[PDB]
Amino acid sequence: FVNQHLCGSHLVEALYLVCGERGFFYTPK
Amino acid sequence: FVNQHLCGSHLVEALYLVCGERGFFYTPK
Amino acid sequence: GIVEQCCTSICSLYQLENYCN
Amino acid sequence: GIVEQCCTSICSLYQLENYCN
Prior knowledge:
The complex is a heterotetramer, with two copies of chain A (29 residues) and two copies of chain C (21 residues). By secondary structure, chain A is an alpha+beta fold. Chain A has one domain (1-29). Chain A contains one helix and one strand. Chain C has 21 residues and is mainly α. Helix content of chain C is 52%, strand content 0%. Chain C is built from two helices and no strands. Chain C is flat and about 25 Å long. In chain C, 24% of the residues are buried. The chains are: A alpha+beta (29), C mainly alpha (21). Chains A and D meet through helix 1 and strand 1 of A and helix 1 and helix 2 of D. Strand 1 of chain A pairs antiparallel with strand 1 of chain B. Chains C, D: It comes from Homo sapiens.
């Protein structure tokens, strides 16, 4: 799932799924 | 939608929807 | 932290907005 | 930034993981 265009809520979801317990920072700038 | 139990991907989605262009930091600790 | 405040207890706008950049 | 790299162009695992804490 990560090797595609990921926009809006799909991007945030990809980051949630990938970073797990770490969490993540989202800055769409 | 924000005045409820928001867990897992629902929480990340709530933060996406609320913080808009700012973005946000997710640390589930 | 966020899971404590918003998942295992009820969330609020004020708390969500504390996590915005 | 992320929208540039992952939405208007194709994303990758390496780039997603740069945004993890």
